Symmetry: C3
Subunit: 270 residues, 3 copies
């Protein structure tokens, strides 16, 4: 695998928010998508631009305690400080004893572990979360990737009834990364589309018995993802995704997957 | 791939509830079981007999936005109004891009999307939900199918501690369709029986690594199903199923899977 | 296909608790680990030493209604009474209808079903739960097994912020049994390690599409397990496990998987 180096910044944002960015003043919630192939090493030159301690902690990937991002393992970052975190990944294969070592590939996420509490409750609430995708050799690559985070009662820390919306063309291969944070369980639902409940969100072939779903229960720090063919067997349209917990959809935990015809039109909606 | 047609009616019942039915005054909660084979197209000639806007929205199956059953897609039904909803299904197969297209087959459900709120909160609460099963070629068919819906704190909108109960005989292949709605997470548990956490609820063979379970966390609009051999390795008896969230079972989210001997008898129990 | 016999006692414990034990005055919370191979029968000579009715109910395994442990089937135990419960297990096999009968193998649990309520709400709250593992022929056996029960807001009925901690050496094959009870949903997370969402928690091979996860939503009476190679690809250290529901980790639903180097030392303990 390849050795990669990136910079990452934690920054305070308007309305008491906090975000990660690849450049100063370009912090976003969710944070930037990090994509790796199994075997790749990533060195993250992390700068905490804030006035409180902050950290970077990742799910799924290989890291040593020196890159835990915790007070326990003295790997958080002082205010205005810098730390180089290292994430490693590995491909699957048989061990010496004939057991199968699972690879790093999957839909994962990174977040703060020290803002507000020693579990990053305040950091997470304020927006310090982002997606990580680790791909296996031969994995099907998409035309676009969209990240949806159910953070307490908000989506991507947007005000209620505020999307986000995602645009595609009929036939586009669209990947979704779906992360949950905070206090509450949710159920993720997408109209007119469906996926497999497995590593890639896609059945491997006819021997894969994974349930095909369009609704999934998720809790804090769950991550999954999938790919769909936009509008496959259903056509162009305003295709809602929403939390299916009835009070949550009613309070505006809803967005649109806007699937246009090749001619740029979409069947008239609202 | 057969093209089929049914009539469906939304009706107000007693205790203010609301139900789907195949005939006028025959509405049930849950709604009627709709069963399709992959490839089938179903045209639902729907009539809203109620004095409020209602709709039909489906999980899992192929439909165009004109059959969304939402206000967003101008697909709900005015009071007394009619609409033909079209559901399509497909078999699995190889795409030209070399990927495997997942089929429609599964345990699915349909429900209202406009009663009370633009997400059907009032309709779902009052009973406008029912099961849909899409079968793959070669799928094993059961002796009977039973639908269990955890709707907020009730089962099938029954009052607390009033079932439903389902009866079978030892050896019967019994299918359960398990749907959840409303506000709360649940855990579905059955005494004396277990199933696979996969598409059909049954392991394909010794090369299927799916967890074998008797307890499953479910949230609103989750659906799964399974088939068991009634009493297999455990015998006839009153086999409780219940939510395993302790306050929920204590409040009466409990029913009985009554498995009889081939002589029609059951070991004595005290409900 | 071994017939096994054990004695089990239900007893009141200090601090308003109740537990199962293999010997009088030796009750623990969780109760003793019961391990069976598919085909084994277990006869449990159960004695209720308490002043309230109590029972033994099991998930997953084969039992007749006479061993349900319920009020419904009159198979609980009066105060000071004794009853033999029988649990059976079976190997998988091909049915005469051509379908595959799922075996008993898996991560399971037993608990009371009649203390406090006819669903055992009081018994479970006070500590009457324990793990059951049923193995399939050829299953990989671990160096150690550790049971983590999320019981309402507690782990193993320990007071908040009280572990438990589990020690291993790098390269040990360590098995976790993860059981949930009570009123609340949880998300189980382990730093530095991951497992397969399937029967054994280990991918069978390259043909297994199971998601690889480090975070799993669980609710009352859910049970799963897995094995990890301690420190595999991540090294020695204090590896936190916790509930990832943020208020739960903040209130102390946390422990340590203490992974020692071959020499005995743990980095960050100097
Ligand atoms: Cu943590
Ligand atoms: Cu939600
Ligand atoms: Cu829907
Ligand atoms: Cu985390
Ligand atoms: Cu919807
Ligand atoms: Cu419940
Ligand atoms: Cu049980
Ligand atoms: Cu729905
Ligand atoms: Cu029970
Ligand atoms: Cu928790
Ligand atoms: Cu973590
Ligand atoms: Cu139980
Ligand atoms: Cu010390």
């Amino acid at each position: 695998g390849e050795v990669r180096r990136i910079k990452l910044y934690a920054e305070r944002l308007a309305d008491g928010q906090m975000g990660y960015g690849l450049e100063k003043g370009r912090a976003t919630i969710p944070g930037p998508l990090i994509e790796l192939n199994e075997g790749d090493t990533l060195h993250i030159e992390f700068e905490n631009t804030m006035d409180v301690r902050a950290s970077l902690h990742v799910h799924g990937l290989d890291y040593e305690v020196s890159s835990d991002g915790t007070t326990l393992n003295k790997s958080d970052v002082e205010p205005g400080g810098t730390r180089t975190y290292t994430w490693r990944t590995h491909a699957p294969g048989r061990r010496s004893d004939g057991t199968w070592r699972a690879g790093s590939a999957g839909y994962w996420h990174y977040h703060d572990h020290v803002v507000g509490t020693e579990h990053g409750t305040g950091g997470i609430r304020k927006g310090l979360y982002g997606p990580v995708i680790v791909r296996r050799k031969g994995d099907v690559l998409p035309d676009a990737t969209h990240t949806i985070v159910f953070n307490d009662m908000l989506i991507n820390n947007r005000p209620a009834h505020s999307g986000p919306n995602f645009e595609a063309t009929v036939g586009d291969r669209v990947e979704f990364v779906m992360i949950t944070h905070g206090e509450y369980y949710h159920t993720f639902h997408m109209h007119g589309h469906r996926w497999a409940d497995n590593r890639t969100g896609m059945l491997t072939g006819p021997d894969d018995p994974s349930q095909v779903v369009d609704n999934k229960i998720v809790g804090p720090a769950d991550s999954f993802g999938f790919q769909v063919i936009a509008g496959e067997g259903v056509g162009a349209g305003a295709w809602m995704y929403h939390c299916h917990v009835q009070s949550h959809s009613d309070m505006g935990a809803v967005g649109l997957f806007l699937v246009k015809k090749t001619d740029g039109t979409i069947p008239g909606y609202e």
